Design a protein around this nucleic acid. Structure first.
Ligand SMILES: [Mg+2]
Ligand SMILES: [Mg+2]
Lengths: 233, 155, 75, 101, 45, 199, 526
RNA sequence: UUUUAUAUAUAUAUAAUAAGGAAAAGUAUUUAUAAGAA
RNA sequence: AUAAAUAAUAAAUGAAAAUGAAAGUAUUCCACCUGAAGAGUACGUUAGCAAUAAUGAAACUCAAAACAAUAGACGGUUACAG
């Protein structure tokens, strides 16, 4: 669609109507819209910096900036073909946002596929209210998940307690293992205590799965016997 | 001094105004730089910047034969009241037909009289003239009593 | 507007640039020739199997056909 | 719709407009200079309040298309000098045409 | 060739770093100063 | 800044996954993260994703690939099955150490299925649980395989198959049996090989 | 820092020397901050073209050199000095376009630019009321959001408001704001003064009385028109703002230190306006009453005449020549006027507004009283010096002594004040005033202060005077005299149609085609 | 940004530090002129 | 990620169909057109073994002639239902 003129100039048309005498009474919105001018510029704006990683867009390194040879052993003496092409599209494209965590996360759920099965809630609660110190993995108001491992890894690297990504990742992983072992032991011991003290449970996960399997299998029984009868003829 | 390049720049500025880009790049030459400066003085362009083919110069770069091929002049366009300030940009003196006017004919052209099939100067328009390898507005060239080549119209 | 657009390259700068360009050319020529020599050495290492004399031809023919060597027959 | 009018009598400048095969070339005119245009354009100018105009119509001469093109040219092919001056960040004296004798 | 180029460049950079050392170099040899330094440094090598 | 918050946003927390949602190959471990929504947000079709999930969906769990697509649909599936299998493993009690002291993509030990330690036994009001018993279903007339609590295992028999097997034939899966999980091990590819005995 | 101090002292040689030194000997070229300081230098020197060129270069050279909000505020100040509001609005739109974040100074500068532009119909392009309304809107936009405040900005804000009040002729608002500023300033300074209040009244009051605020209040008085309706009354936000300011002014008055404002919310008549102008002027002259210069007595008159007779008839002998004695008298009068009356408040600009008040109010008697009492003609003063020289070296004598004594109340009548009195003659249609003014102007041409100025400035001022005389004779109907003036000085003065438009209209109304042709040939021969 | 610190091999990685604030009133001649209809 | 091909488009252009990186915004050069029919016809000339190919009119007659799209009718036009 073309940039539309009529939507934002309603005040001007109404002013013409009023001054000409075509309209006698000012609309209630007239004074408000006059006090608050609509934004009447619709321009594609250049972007020179990628916020996610800080890469600077629109920079060319001149020949003079290299007084030494490159990896192949060649001095840069003249611009090459790619350097001699105007890159306005690079300025006007929306920059792709890339984060380091996105890699480690992909590693973590590759290393621990069953951690994916633990349900996640994407409803944000309140982002601004987060007050976390990442010297320790467990945070109040937060679950214990792989993202905690990546956050602890980034905290470790930021403080330079460890140097390489792998080392901090491994340390956070081992803290994660300890904490999850503790939680598993709490769950097992709690169930054992409940059975120790007379608690009676109507249904368990195995029996629930067996029940659902039984319904599905009964329907499948009916359908298979009917289909065998149909196919025989 | 290529009039072909000035025509290409004019078409580029028109196309940029149509799609409403806030910044654009043109070739870095003396004629183009003077033309852009004249447009900027009249208020048709928001800003002039020197840069590479990739973008404006982050730090000041001296111009030498080493980097001349990759140099560009970045102009910021203006869009006011939902309308482009620089709407149409055309050539008067074309490469096939080049028009060099004496001063009196230039006054006549400014005074509503058509000269050599050039439409007379319009009120909110700017006509640029080249005299002694210097680009100026028609009014200045008349005030300087300089006979010159009548290049382009910016309305 | 009334000043030079560019700063002319000094003769000394041009000499340095020419030396750099000549070094680049000679370097690429050098890697080309050394790669060619490496291919020549690799071909020398296998030149023994290649038959250029009648005796080697008789020997290899007898080996492949008269001798019951492993044959490239697709199963 | 309201149309720009220079001195409440004429168009601000020359208008070269295209409408569905109708080419309108409308030139402003001095005070006292009558309306010298197509009859459709004459009636439209009479109703609009434009007193001084010259112009010529090329290619299609359909009256309906001439009328619609005339209205649309008055609306989009025209800009007040105040608008030009404000857009270019200049005073009205800087955009006025200088007199040459 | 590579040694010559690198030595020329490093000496130019070193002398350009200390401006007074550049003037001493010029006087012992006996933006204009930039070109004179370049000429003298290459003539040295 | 906005970029930092987007990096730490829960939508960003979900790793990039693009595997086929509908997969008919062998399934050894979860391949998509399960997204859970509270009942209150389900009432308003809010799942924390870019767009509202259709009101037809009544389950509170799904697995998704794309927040948005060219077809203006969210590429998802209303399935949250895998967690139950994991949870069902915790009911079995059979234990399965890399969890004790450049990037490698191998599944590290048990990849979150079970973090228990082998050396523990279950006390019950009857007494010490010597051997854990769970119900399952023998699947085919073949060793014999059984679907036990979300996992397929090979059952180790005790003398002869019960005659019920031979009488029923291919309808064997209809009837439940009680098995005792002899052992649980994890293969390199992530499969969980359990050996059980039909009592 | 070097350029900062050089701008503060406005030394071109120091600026040039420091820039050249750094470029030649240290390889340092000005960055964004130094270029901004250079722009402020050019602004201080009234050098707008060079400042705009420097701004263009700041954009041109690199993104690091690209202007930021500080430079844009400096350019807005330059536009305020030019009274160039289209450029101010364009620069605001450019600030928004380039994603630069405004500040409080930006909104205050825009408001001040619009207020200054709205002074006259010519500079405002006939949009004065709309420009004042737009400035008030910019102040409201500032009110909406915090932005970045500066310690000085608050002061600036109030000036802007008074500007919008002063150019609107809003005497109620101008009075209220002036009283608020003076009251708060005196209270704050008295609260935080180490010295005892009673002893240091002179210093505190001198610091309190900002000359610009008084000048704006006098400008508000001068633009009085009873039929005028304030532009700020139309808006609901504006009327609420007016209500707030007026209510606070009234409450503060009802509730130490006192000011001579009449006990009335607003002035509805010319006589009250004259009374308050005189009252505030005298209050400012007396440094809040600390100096009793304006209050005079015949006893004080006799004693001052006696003392100054002693001083001058003693001085007469010491000097080597008349020139040295005259120089001594110059130093004496210059030091005396500063001692007796505040130098900052009492100057050419404030006196110009003070005398412009009655001209707009159409009261000749008060204008002439103020002119005689507060202004001295240089040629008369030098004649008195020669007369006293003759008297001492070898009832009129005491009159000359009283003249020298009264110089402490008076400012020299420069060319601008002569032009103002000529404007008063045009407005009042007084032939006698015009004749006296042209005689005094001719005598002043001989005096040294006029010949001190450049030839081009002298020609410009003489041409302005000639145009004023032409306008006077045009209003009086003596078109023959106007054309005689125009023809007599065609070569030395460039006559344009703007100056002779009234003459041409008057001649066309009576259809004197010959005179019209002669005048048009004079103007348009070019 | 700039400058400097510690550390490491003239250079590199981290930490700190930022000089761009000015206020004042008043000072026409515009041009030449292109119409379509069945 | 960089290019080109393809498809659908935005703006723009167009009588519209539609074009869509050209049928867009501009520059340069070349070829071609000036109502239908007479007519690519006649005559002449050039080339070919020839068939023919190139170049190419005029008189006379008329207010016609054509393009896109619209709504109908019609089709020995399709499919779907009843
Ligand atoms: Mg066509
Ligand atoms: Mg033929």
């Amino acid at each position: 669609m073309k940039i539309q003129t009529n939507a934002v100039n309603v005040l001007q048309r109404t002013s013409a109507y009023l001054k000409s005498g075509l309209l006698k009474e000012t609309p209630a919105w007239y004074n408000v819209v006059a006090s608050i001018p609509p934004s009447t510029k619709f321009t594609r704006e250049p972007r020179f910096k990628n916020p996610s990683n800080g890469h600077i867009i629109g920079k060319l390194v001149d020949v003079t900036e290299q007084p030494h040879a490159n990896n192949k052993g060649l001095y840069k003496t003249r611009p090459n073909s790619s350097d001699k092409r105007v890159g306005v599209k690079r300025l006007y494209r929306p920059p792709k946002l890339t984060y380091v965590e996105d890699r480690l996360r992909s590693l973590f759920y590759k290393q621990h596929p069953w951690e994916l099965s633990r349900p996640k809630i994407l409803v944000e609660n309140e982002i601004g209210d987060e007050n976390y110190d990442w010297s320790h993995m467990l945070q109040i108001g937060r679950p214990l998940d792989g993202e905690s491992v990546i956050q602890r890894t980034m905290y470790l690297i930021k403080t330079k307690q460890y140097g390489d990504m792998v080392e901090a990742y491994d340390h956070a992983r081992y803290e994660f293992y300890a904490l999850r072992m503790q939680e598993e032991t709490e769950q097992q011991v709690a169930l054992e205590e409940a059975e120790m003290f007379g608690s009676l449970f109507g249904v368990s996960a195995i029996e629930h799965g067996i029940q659902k399997e039984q319904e599905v299998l009964d329907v499948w029984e009916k359908k298979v016997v009917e289909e065998t009868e149909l196919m025989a003829a | 001094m290529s009039l072909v390049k000035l025509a290409n720049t004019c078409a580029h500025l028109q196309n940029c105004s149509k799609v409403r880009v806030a910044l654009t790049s043109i070739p870095y030459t003396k004629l183009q730089l003077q033309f852009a400066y004249n447009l900027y003085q009249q208020g048709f362009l928001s800003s002039l910047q020197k840069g590479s083919t990739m973008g404006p110069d982050k730090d000041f770069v001296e111009v030498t034969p080493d980097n001349i091929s990759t140099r560009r002049l970045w102009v910021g366009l203006k869009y006011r009241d939902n309308k482009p300030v620089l709407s149409s940009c055309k050539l008067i003196s074309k490469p096939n037909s080049r028009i060099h006017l004496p001063m009196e004919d230039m006054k006549k052209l400014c005074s509503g009289v058509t000269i050599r099939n050039i439409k007379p100067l319009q009120p909110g328009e700017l006509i640029l003239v080249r005299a002694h390898n210097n680009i100026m507005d028609i009014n200045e060239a008349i005030s300087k009593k300089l006979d010159g080549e009548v290049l382009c119209r910016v309305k | 507007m009334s000043q030079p657009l560019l700063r002319n390259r000094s003769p000394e700068e041009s000499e340095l640039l020419k030396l750099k360009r000549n070094y680049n050319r000679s370097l690429l020529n050098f890697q080309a020739h050394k790669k060619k020599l490496n291919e020549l050495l690799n071909l020398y290492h296998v030149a023994n199997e290649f038959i250029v004399t009648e005796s080697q031809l008789l020997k290899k023919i007898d080996k492949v056909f008269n001798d019951e060597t492993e044959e490239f027959t697709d199963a | 719709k309201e149309i720009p009018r220079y001195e409440n009598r004429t168009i601000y400048g020359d208008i070269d407009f295209r409408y569905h095969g109708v080419k309108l070339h409308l030139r402003s005119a001095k005070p006292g200079f009558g309306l010298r245009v197509n009859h459709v354009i004459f009636e439209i100018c009479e109703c609009a309040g434009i007193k001084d105009l010259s112009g010529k119509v090329y290619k299609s001469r359909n009256d309906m298309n001439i009328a619609k093109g005339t209205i649309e040219a008055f609306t989009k092919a025209q800009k007040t000098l105040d608008e030009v001056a404000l857009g270019r960040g200049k005073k009205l004296v800087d955009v006025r045409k200088v007199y040459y004798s | 060739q590579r040694s010559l180029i690198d030595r020329i460049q490093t000496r130019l950079s070193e002398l350009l770093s200390n401006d007074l050392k550049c003037d001493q170099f010029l006087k012992d040899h006996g933006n204009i100063k930039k070109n004179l330094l370049r000429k003298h440094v290459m003539m040295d090598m | 800044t906005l970029a930092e918050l987007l990096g730490r946003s829960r939508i960003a927390q979900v790793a990039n996954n693009h595997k086929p949602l509908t997969y008919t190959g062998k399934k050894f471990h979860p391949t998509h993260q399960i997204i859970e929504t509270k009942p209150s947000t389900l009432y308003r079709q809010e799942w924390g994703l870019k767009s509202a999930i259709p009101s037809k969906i009544k389950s509170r769990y799904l697995v998704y690939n794309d927040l948005d697509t060219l077809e203006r649909i969210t590429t998802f599936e209303p399935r949250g099955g895998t967690q139950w299998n994991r949870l069902r493993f915790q009911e079995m009690g059979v234990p399965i150490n890399p969890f004790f002291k450049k990037f490698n993509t191998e599944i590290i030990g048990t990849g979150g299925l079970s973090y228990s330690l082998p050396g523990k036994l279950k006390n019950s009001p009857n007494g010490v649980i010597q051997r854990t018993v769970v119900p399952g279903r023998i699947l085919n007339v073949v060793k014999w395989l059984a679907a036990i609590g979300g996992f397929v295992a090979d059952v180790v028999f005790f003398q002869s198959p019960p005659s019920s097997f031979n009488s029923m034939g291919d309808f064997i899966r209809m009837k439940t049996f009680l098995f005792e999980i002899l052992e649980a091990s994890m293969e390199k590819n992530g499969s969980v090989s359990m050996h059980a005995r039909l009592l | 820092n070097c350029l900062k101090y050089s701008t503060k002292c406005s030394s071109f040689h120091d600026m040039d020397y420091f820039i050249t030194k750094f470029r030649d000997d240290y390889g340092i070229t000005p960055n964004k901050q130094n270029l901004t300081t250079v722009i402020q230098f050019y602004s201080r020197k009234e050098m707008t073209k060079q400042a705009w060129n420097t701004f263009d270069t700041m954009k041109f050279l690199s993104t690091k050199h690209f202007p930021d909000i500080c430079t844009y505020n400096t350019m807005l100040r330059i536009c305020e000095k030019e009274r160039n509001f289209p450029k101010a609005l364009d620069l605001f739109q450019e600030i928004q376009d380039h994603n630069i974040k405004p500040t409080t100074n930006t909104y205050i500068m825009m408001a001040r630019v619009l207020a200054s532009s709205s002074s006259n119909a010519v500079v405002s392009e006939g949009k004065s009321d709309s420009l004042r309304l737009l400035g008030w809107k910019y102040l409201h936009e500032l009110e909406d959001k915090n932005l970045y405040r500066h310690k000085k900005d608050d002061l600036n804000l109030f000036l802007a408001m008074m500007a919008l009040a002063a150019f609107d002729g809003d005497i109620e608002l101008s009075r209220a704001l002036y009283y608020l500023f003076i009251a708060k300033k005196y209270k704050t300074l008295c609260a935080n003064w180490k010295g005892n209040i009673l002893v240091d009244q002179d210093t505190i009051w001198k610091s309190t009385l900002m000359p610009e605020m008084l000048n704006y209040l006098m400008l508000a008085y001068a633009r009085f028109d009873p039929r005028n309706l304030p532009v700020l009354s139309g808006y609901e936000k504006g009327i609420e703002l007016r209500r707030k300011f007026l209510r606070e002014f009234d409450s503060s008055m009802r509730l130490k230190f006192k000011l001579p404002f009449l006990p009335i919310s607003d002035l509805n008549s010319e006589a009250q306006v004259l009374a308050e102008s005189n009252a505030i002027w005298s209050f400012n002259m007396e440094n809040g009453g600390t100096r009793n210069t304006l209050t005079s007595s015949n006893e004080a008159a006799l004693e001052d005449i006696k003392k100054y007779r002693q001083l001058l008839d003693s001085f007469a002998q010491e000097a080597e020549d008349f020139n040295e004695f005259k120089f001594k008298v110059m130093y004496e009068v210059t030091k005396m006027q500063r001692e007796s009356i505040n130098v900052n408040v009492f100057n050419k600009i404030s006196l110009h507004t003070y005398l412009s008040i009655p001209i707009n109010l159409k009261q000749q008697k008060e204008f002439l009283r103020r002119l005689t009492f507060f202004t001295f003609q240089q040629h008369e003063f030098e004649a008195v010096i020669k007369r006293l020289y003759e008297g001492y070296r070898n009832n009129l004598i005491m009159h000359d002594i009283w003249y020298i004594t009264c110089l402490r109340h008076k400012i020299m009548m420069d060319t601008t004040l002569y032009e103002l009195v000529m404007k008063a003659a045009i407005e009042f249609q007084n032939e006698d005033l015009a004749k006296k003014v042209w005689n005094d102007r001719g005598k002043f041409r001989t005096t040294v202060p006029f010949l001190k100025m450049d030839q081009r400035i002298r020609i410009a001022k003489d041409q302005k005077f000639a145009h004023l005389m032409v306008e006077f004779f045009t209003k009086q109907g003596k078109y023959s005299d106007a054309i005689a003036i125009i023809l007599s000085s065609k070569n030395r003065f460039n006559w344009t149609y703007s100056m002779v438009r009234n003459l041409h209209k008057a001649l066309e109304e009576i259809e004197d085609r010959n005179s019209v042709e002669i005048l048009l040939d004079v103007v348009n021969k070019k």
